[PDB]
Every structure is written in C-alpha cells, then in structure tokens.
Amino acid sequence: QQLMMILNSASDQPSENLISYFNNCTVNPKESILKRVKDIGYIFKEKFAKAVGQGEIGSQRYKLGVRLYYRVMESMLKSEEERLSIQNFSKLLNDNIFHMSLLACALEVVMATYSLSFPWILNVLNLKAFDFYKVIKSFIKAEGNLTREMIKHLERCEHRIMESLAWLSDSPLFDLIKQSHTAADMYLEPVRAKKSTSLSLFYKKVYRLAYLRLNTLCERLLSEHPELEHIIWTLFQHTLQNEYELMRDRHLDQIMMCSMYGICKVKNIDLKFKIIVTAYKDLPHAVQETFKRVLIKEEEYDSIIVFYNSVFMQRLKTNILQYASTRPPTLAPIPH
C-alpha cells in the first residue's frame, strides 16, 4: 500500500531527473517513448473493456501503470548509466521491446494488486513471454517499494514462463536454441549474431527450478533408492538441453515426471505413475491439468501416461537404456 500512495500522488509525465537522461542520449528517445505510451493507451483500454464490460477504469489502471513505468525506468537508468556506453545507453532508451516489457510489467503490477490474470497483459500487448521474462528481475531490483505479495507475483509469472510460456510455438526461445547481466544487457543483444546471454541465463534458471521441483518429489517418493535423485536429474537435464524440442507447447513438470518414472523403471523399480501424480498435486502450484491434459502429437491431447509411452520413449529409448548398462552416462552437475 505504500507504493500505491506514491503512484496516485505522482505525475503522468516523466520526471525532470528522468528527462535529463533522455537528453544525455545521442538519439533523444522522448518522443518515441511518449508516443508509445499514448499508442498503447488505446489498445489497453480497448481490450480492457472487452473483458470488464462497460464501466473508465481501463483508463485508470493504465495511468497508474504509466506512473510506475516512468518511476522504474528512472530507477533502472540510474544503474545503467554507469554500466553502458553512451551508444548502448541510447540504444536501450529507443528499444521498443524494452519499453513494451517495462510498461507491460508496470501494468501487471497495478492489475494484480487491484484484482485479466497474467498472461493477460502479454496477449493484450502482443509481447512474447520470453521477451517479457527478461525484464522481471531488474524490475524487482529497481523498485524497492514492491510489497512481498507483489514480488511473489512477478516471480510466479517468471516461473510460469520458465515452466510453460517461453516454450510455446513462435516463441523466440526456440530460435535462439537453434543457433547454439541485467535486463538492459538482454534487450541490447542483437537478433543476429556469438553466444546469447538471454539463452544462457534462461536455461541456468530453468535448471534450478526443474531440479528444485524434481528434488521435492524425490524426497517424498524415492528413499529406498535415494541414489535415484541424481540419476533422474541427469536424464531430466540431458533431455532439456538436447531434446528440448519436446518442451514445445508442454510443461517442465511433464518432462520432470516422465524422467522420474523412466529411471526407476530401467532400474527395475516397480513404482507406478499413480503415486507420482497424486504426490504432484501437492506441489505449491500444481494443477491436475498439468498431467490430465498433456499433448501427444499434431494437436491431439491425452493423459501423461500416454505421453510417456508414445512420445517420450520414441526419442529416449537409446538414452534411458544407457543408464542400465555397465557404463551408464556420467552424472550431470546439480545447479548452484
């Protein structure tokens, strides 16, 4: 509630300290920024009314959004003025996806407080989840007044992007995989190259999530062969790096769960999917759809026991059976 007061008493235009940054740029960004907020005003209010009906509020959410947007931009530019060359500084301040993502993230903060759920704001602004993802941590860090509940919200957004939304079709994540540290660093990367800080950072975090989640399920279910934890992870991680195509329009936890059943299967352990899914409903955000509605092929859906048999084994029979021979694949690092 303390940030909400700073916003309502604040202005709808950029600060004087903020505009100086705009003037220190080689290409003054101010008119393209301002036009961008105005141009976005229309589409926001439109789609906002297309869901909440006939109110005036759409206009009000957005103007608080804009108020946060400029506040944070100014906070963020304060660190980046020492970090970035003059030409990088200006490139940032004229970069459209940077602004789309900063504003989209301000707006999600207002929306969520006054609760149209995430990922609503991405569909409204036609912003890819993987581009939006890049702004979240730097946004949090630059707005010291976010409440706990709000921080937790942006992180649930971030985790859902890592777990699902970044892996949708047409997402730039797959483009970047084919080829192979602040938000400004990631937005300044050219679309055409070198190694991508965006991709490496994303995977680094995905692994920590996946392993953390996988770890939770293993301490509950797999203690009579506790060695299995590290084994399952090696398959899980090997699959995320080199068989990444299976995450297309899928969920990290679907891949997680198959790696569990497969590894205990090939070590001749009898422990069915039934115990896995029931125990998984107990994860902090688990929805049973994660395993009741799983995609197989060509837009046809079935339960997870079907995905494991028809899609997962097709690809990994070579890989999984490796784990039972006399020279099994070497163990993957546990993410820090």
Numbering used by the authors: 383 to 437, 440 to 499, 512 to 576, 600 to 612, 642 to 784
Original authors' sentences:
The retinoblastoma tumor suppressor (Rb) is a multifunctional protein that primarily regulates the cell cycle but also has roles in cellular differentiation, DNA damage response, and apoptosis. The pocket domain is the most highly conserved region of the multidomain protein, as well as the most frequent site of mutations.
For E554K and E533K, we sought to understand the structural basis for large reductions in RbP-E2F1TD binding as well as substantial decreases in thermostability. Remarkably, the crystal structure of E533K shows something similar in which the mutated lysine sidechain creates a salt bridge triad with E554 and E551 in a manner that occludes the Y411(E2F1TD)-binding pocket. However, from these structures alone, it is not clear how the mutations induce fold destabilization. It is possible that the loss of the salt bridge interactions contributes to the large destabilization effects observed for these variants.
